[PDB]
Amino acid sequence: MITIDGSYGEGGGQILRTSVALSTITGEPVRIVNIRANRPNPGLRPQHLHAILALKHLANAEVKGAHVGSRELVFIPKKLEAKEISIDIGTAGSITLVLQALLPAMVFAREKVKFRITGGTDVSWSPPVDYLSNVTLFALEKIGIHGEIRVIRRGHYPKGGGIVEGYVEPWNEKRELVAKEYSRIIKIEGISHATNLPSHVAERQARAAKDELLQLKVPIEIRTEISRSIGPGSGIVVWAETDCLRLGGDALGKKGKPAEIVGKEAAQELLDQLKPGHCVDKFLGDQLIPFLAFSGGVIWVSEITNHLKTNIWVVESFLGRIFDVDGNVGEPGKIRVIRRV
């Protein structure tokens, strides 16, 4: 069967998540070894098990080695069938990382797939959920995918308490994405949230981000959201709407980090993403990879990330050579789908 080396490259959870997703899509069983080698705490942790179990449910799969601390996993899918998914990730485990994996699988079911996921909506080392709703879905629509991703309640580190609900439709009509350079920025929009914290936190984040983006000379509208959950947290995402795709930048609130810095950092990230003039930002760059194998097309990315390289590695391990890549990790890049499947 297809065997994936979990120590390849960046060697973390990404290779694990994408591999099971591809197994689920292709129907080909997969063995993953050396799980999370490049980490202080190697092996399967509870967060990874929730993702694995969700996909197992979707694919009626047999699974072996799916235990906390395990370094090796075998996943044998059966037919993919639209089921209602409920996932309670522990504490502030990232909803968006689970969702990034689930999305490409779910759109290959024959009927609408609804989901509810609890955990962290806005945690470090992953995209904020508002990025998925407003940037990722916007891009997926271009290739024929339709869905919703809604924040019912925010969850931050460490307490969690987040609730996300949504659905995707079956990907029946696939079309290619051709997204090289953008021509112009049309407008900036964003969402600045504060949870169990004073409303001035959301305001000051939004104001600082806006100030930092005035230089682009386009309208800027950053909505504020003040909400309730089981712990304090804040964050902001801003996105540039271009003639092609949206590019995004984000930052998370942190105890002892003033709200102005958080807002400025999100703006600076967006500015960094926009700099090369390429259509696809660094986050969307990895997220698109599993879909592009099936839609076809070409994307130019502001920055090639390890996750993008990891995703290509996995998809090609399942499907043969698919992608031509021009550029090194950390540089702007060009990704062409040579052969659509």
Asked if residue 286 belongs to a known ligand binding site, the reply is: yes
Å resolution of this model? 1.9
Residue 307 falls in the annotated catalytic set: yes
Is 218 exposed, middle or buried (CB count within 10 Å of its CB: 0-12, 13-18, 19+)? Answer: middle
Q: Which are the contacts of 86, defined by CB distance < 8 A and separation ≥ 6?
A: 115, 116, 117
C-alpha dist (Å) from residue 285 to 79, 248, 281, 304, 341? 29, 11, 6, 7, 19
Whether residue 158 is preceded by a cis peptide bond, meaning omega within 30 degrees of 0, is yes
CATH for the stretch 182-275: 3.30.360.20
Task: Compute the distance between CA of residue 98 and CA of residue 87 in angstroms, rounded to an integer.
Answer: 9
Annotate 198-252 with DSSP letters as a single string: -HHHHHHHHHHHHHHHGGG-S-EEEEEEEE--SS-EEEEEEEEEESS-EEEEEEE
Asked if residue 287 belongs to a known ligand binding site, the reply is: yes
Helix-, strand-, coil-residue percentages of the chain, each rounded to 5: 35, 30, 35
Joined together, the tokens standing for residue 333 give 């890049």
CATH 3.65.10.20 domain position(s) in the chain: 1-178+276-336
Asked if residue 291 belongs to a known ligand binding site, the reply is: no
Task: Compute the distance between CA of residue 142 and CA of residue 179 in angstroms, rounded to an integer.
Answer: 10
Annotate 98-143 with DSSP letters as a single string: HHHHHHHHHTTSSS-EEEEEEEBSB-TTS--HHHIIIIIHHHHHTT
Task: Compute the distance between CA of residue 207 and CA of residue 193 in angstroms, rounded to an integer.
Answer: 12
CATH for the stretch 1-178+276-336: 3.65.10.20
Strand, helix or coil at 312? helix
Catalytic residue among 48, 50, 278, 307: 307
Is 153 exposed, middle or buried (CB count within 10 Å of its CB: 0-12, 13-18, 19+)? Answer: middle
Give the closest residue to 6 by CA, choosing from 328, 314, 318, 323: 314
Asked if residue 13 belongs to a known ligand binding site, the reply is: no
Asked if residue 247 belongs to a known ligand binding site, the reply is: no
Asked if residue 285 belongs to a known ligand binding site, the reply is: yes
Assess contact for 53 and 66: CB atoms under 8 A: yes
Q: Which phi and psi (to 5°) does residue 285 adopt?
A: -55, -45
The technique by which this structure was obtained is: X-ray
